[PDB]
Design an enzyme around this catalytic site. Structure first.
Site, PDB file in Angstrom:
ATOM      1  N   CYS A 284      54.355-100.400 -70.934  1.00 27.08           N
ATOM      2  CA  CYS A 284      53.781-100.901 -72.227  1.00 27.08           C
ATOM      3  C   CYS A 284      54.151-100.190 -73.331  1.00 27.08           C
ATOM      4  CB  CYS A 284      52.164-101.220 -72.196  1.00 27.08           C
ATOM      5  SG  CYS A 284      51.178 -99.979 -72.041  1.00 27.08           S
TER       6      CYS A 284
ATOM      7  N   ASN B   6      51.327 -96.707 -73.097  1.00 28.27           N
ATOM      8  CA  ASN B   6      51.144 -96.118 -71.545  1.00 28.27           C
ATOM      9  C   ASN B   6      49.495 -95.712 -71.557  1.00 28.27           C
ATOM     10  OD1 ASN B   6      52.228 -93.763 -69.511  1.00 28.27           O
ATOM     11  ND2 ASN B   6      51.582 -95.912 -68.911  1.00 28.27           N
TER      12      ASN B   6
ATOM     13  N   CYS C 102      46.834 -98.290 -72.283  1.00 30.50           N
ATOM     14  CA  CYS C 102      45.865 -99.528 -71.958  1.00 30.50           C
ATOM     15  C   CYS C 102      46.374-100.224 -70.915  1.00 30.50           C
ATOM     16  CB  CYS C 102      45.695-100.034 -73.129  1.00 30.50           C
ATOM     17  SG  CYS C 102      44.720 -99.391 -74.697  1.00 30.50           S
ATOM     18  N   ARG C 103      47.607-101.085 -71.239  1.00 24.16           N
ATOM     19  CA  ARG C 103      47.924-102.065 -70.234  1.00 24.16           C
ATOM     20  C   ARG C 103      48.574-101.582 -69.064  1.00 24.16           C
ATOM     21  NH1 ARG C 103      51.088-105.247 -74.817  1.00 24.16           N
ATOM     22  NH2 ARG C 103      51.221-103.064 -75.429  1.00 24.16           N
ATOM     23  N   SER C 104      49.715-100.646 -69.136  1.00 21.88           N
ATOM     24  CA  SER C 104      50.485-100.170 -68.060  1.00 21.88           C
ATOM     25  C   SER C 104      49.560 -99.373 -67.127  1.00 21.88           C
ATOM     26  CB  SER C 104      51.855 -99.746 -68.552  1.00 21.88           C
ATOM     27  OG  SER C 104      51.602 -98.648 -69.439  1.00 21.88           O
TER      28      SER C 104
ATOM     29  N   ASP D 283      47.836-106.572 -76.075  1.00 14.96           N
ATOM     30  CA  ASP D 283      47.280-105.359 -76.597  1.00 14.96           C
ATOM     31  C   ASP D 283      45.985-105.176 -76.921  1.00 14.96           C
ATOM     32  OD1 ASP D 283      46.890-102.496 -77.405  1.00 14.96           O
ATOM     33  OD2 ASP D 283      49.064-102.485 -78.389  1.00 14.96           O
TER      34      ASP D 283
END
Lengths: 148, 149
Positions: free
Chosen positions: B8, B11, B13-15, B122
């Site tokens: 993301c 690196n 929150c999402r990934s 995000d």
């Protein structure tokens, strides 16, 4: 008086704002220092985006002396106005800026009578978005410098 | 047997969520895959995942231990077999830095799910709903990516 414009990467939006403010300040004979920075340092040391630079030069604006840099703690004390391109930029500034200097922070387009509140990021888009940034910035710069 | 990298922007929150979920799913599904995550930018370098992301994921029994934010590196494009991007801008960023010979590895994570979604939004500047959404999409896409082999 000193004005700092802040976007995310300091390669598209805030460099354009700085170039326009510098040129218009000179025309309007307003003694102000202008600068720009980003909330991130991904582009640190880079010249402005070549599309942003080309589009601005089309309207007579110089991007000489502009290289991407991240905002510093020292910026919140040094500048009198700190203008954010969008609300995420403003959130980052609000988090990092001392309480004493919070009064210095605002959205750039809060000083423009415009249907836009934020300056959209043209980076991943086409030519229309780069022309839009200039349109928004010219108007906001004109109205803001008038207020000064 | 396979190495998967999820990417993301930051690196945090999402990934990292995709990494934690993929690792757990891989274990239960007994599919021999090694998972990692990285960001297109290094602004969050060395930081653990967002405390809200971490809280939300633990709500469902996922752990985020051992995950620290880091920027994507030229080396990653050779090493991994699958590089999964959270959204279109991340993918476009990856396609710009990836060598010609490894472009076949890059894809959007949700393009492996029958999901109606293509991008993982995000959650950073949003509320609790955005964090629950990340988990929902990551769980669906992780399950289908691992099943589909």
């Amino acid at each position: 008086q000193k004005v700092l414009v802040v976007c995310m990467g300091n390669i598209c939006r805030s460099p354009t704002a700085e170039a326009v403010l510098r040129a218009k300040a000179a025309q309007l004979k307003v003694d102000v220092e202008v600068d720009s920075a980003g909330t991130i340092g991904y582009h640190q040391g880079n010249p402005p985006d070549a599309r942003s630079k080309a589009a601005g030069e089309k309207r007579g604006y110089s991007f000489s002396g502009i290289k991407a840099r991240k905002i510093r703690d020292e910026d919140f004390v040094k500048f009198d106005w700190i203008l954010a391109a969008d609300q995420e930029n403003l959130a980052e500034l609000k988090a990092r800026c001392p309480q004493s200097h919070q009064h210095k922070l605002s959205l750039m387009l809060s000083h423009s009578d415009s249907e836009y509140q934020e300056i959209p990021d043209p980076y991943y888009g086409g030519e229309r978005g780069f022309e839009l940034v200039l349109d928004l910035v010219e108007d906001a710069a004109e109205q803001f410098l008038l207020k000064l």
